[PDB]
Each structure stands twice: as C-alpha cells, then as structure tokens.
Amino acid sequence: DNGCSVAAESTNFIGATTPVVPFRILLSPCGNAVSAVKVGFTGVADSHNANLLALENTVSAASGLGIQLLNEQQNQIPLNAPSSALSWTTLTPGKPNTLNFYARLMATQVPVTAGHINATATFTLEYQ
C-alpha cells in the first residue's frame, strides 16, 4: 500500500535565541494502511553544539550562530538521533497528517557576526 506524499515547508530566517518560526511537514495523501512513522532530523551539527544545525560557511556567511529545531511542544529535537532514540508518531490512516515544528537561531559565540544565514537538513520518515 502507498505511504505518504511529503511536502516540507522551508523556513525563512551564548544561549540567546531568536523567536521561533513555525514550519510544517505535510504527509498528504497517505495510504489507507499507514499506522505510524519514526521521524527525525539529520544534518551537520554545529561544532559548539551537537544539537544545533550548523550554518553553511561562506565568504559572506554569519557566525556564532546555529539553528535549533523544536517539536510542536517547543521541546528541542535531537539532531542525528539514532532510530533507537526516536518515539513513534501515530498517523491517521488514509488521511492527511501534518507534522508541526519550529526553527530558531541560537548564539554559540558572542559577539555573533552578521552575514547570510543558510542551512540544509534531512527529515527521515521511517514507516512502521
């Protein structure tokens, strides 16, 4: 039976954080027999903080900052967590399922230096 078609929303952008920005990952349509998925984010971790996503490093890039990802309850999502560490997300069979997250920026070094802020990450959905 079919899984879910996934459409991810992109996000436009010492301990200090910027305000949360919501983004969704929409699973729709979904097959009639979907039940649960284990979901997680992987990417290059910031050198100062393993649970922060590192920004791309270029001539015009910003620094002293990494990206934090949060679940709908605004709890930190562990970057590069092993499957064994992930819980199951229940899905409504045969229907659209929306997964809600937040991203924000967090300072790793003060003073933070200005510049372009760009990053990539990979969201994995493991089907039960």
């Binding site: 079919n2 899984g3 996934v6 929409l26 990053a119 990539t120």
Partner: protein, 200 residues
Amino acid sequence: GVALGATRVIYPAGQKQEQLAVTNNDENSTYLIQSWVENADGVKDGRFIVTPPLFAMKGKKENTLRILDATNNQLPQDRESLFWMNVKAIPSMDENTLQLAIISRIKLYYRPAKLALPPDQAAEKLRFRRSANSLTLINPTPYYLTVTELNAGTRVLENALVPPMGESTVKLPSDAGSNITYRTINDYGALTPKMTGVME
C-alpha cells in the same frame, strides 16, 4: 512532493528483482531521487542493490526503482534478514533559509524459500515473558514481527519489532493489567486481528 508505493518490500529468495514506485504529485516541482539500501546495522553492505540510485523527476510523474538480490545466496536460510530501503527526495531551490530533503525509509525483508512455518501463521506464535516493570516479546518464527497496538490491560505500550527467533523488551507500568493484547503489521502493511497475549 514524493511518496513511495509501499511501506515494506518482501523479497522472496530467487526473484531477480523487486519493484518500488516513487511518485511526485506536484506539477510545479522537480526532485532529485537518491536511493540506497542499508543492512540491519545501518551499513551499505551491497547485499541488495538499487537501480537507478540517482535520477531526476520533473512534475507529476512516477518512476520505478528496481531492488536486486546481490546476496549470492549467502544470507541465513532459516529466517528473514532485515534491510532498510532509503529513498531521499531532494528539492530544487528558487536570503536566509533552512531547506529540507526528505528520506522515506521502509523495511526490505529477504525471505528464504521453504520456510517451514508459512507467513500467515507467524503472528499467533508470539509469546510473552513478564517481569515487574518490563514485558518481553518472544518471536519463535522465521519472520520479523512488527507488533503494534500492544496493550497490557488499558495501558498502551511501545511498539516493537521482534526479530525472527528473537526477542524484544518494552517498558511496562506498575499498574498495567494482566490481560495483554496486540496486533501486527503484515506483509501488505495492514493491521492483523487483535490477539490475546499468551505466556511463554
């Protein structure tokens, strides 16, 4: 966006290939599709090969991946072997942005021929060993059992993937009732009938 045409693939020994559909439902998007198989340890051991492992899909389109048995008959012959099919959908890009690629990951089971116990008899064979605050699931069959809707009394417990001729353990609340019930996810990705848990 991209979807796969299955939530698992059962690969019968002897088959030259199995197929997996990949579909983009968005006329205004183009994705790169990068696919690979990992073994149970997360390693690309080449026992199963995917082709084509990298290609582009423009607009509303379906492409079929081929999964090829490259095991040279070297895997265990009395039980299923677990692999993970991974399909990464990489989006195109049009400022400060976080962009995401998506990996859809599904079970790929290598299933030897001539297994004494047929697959539809597997779910009933599950047995249970209970301690004060844990519940052990015991799978004496050649098949991976994907156990879900696992309840002890009214308490819903964690899902478990119980390996062939193996076991898995989940947490159990102190107050959980004595009556265990469970279902499994079958070869077709569907829930099997609720069963009462039997003690080892």
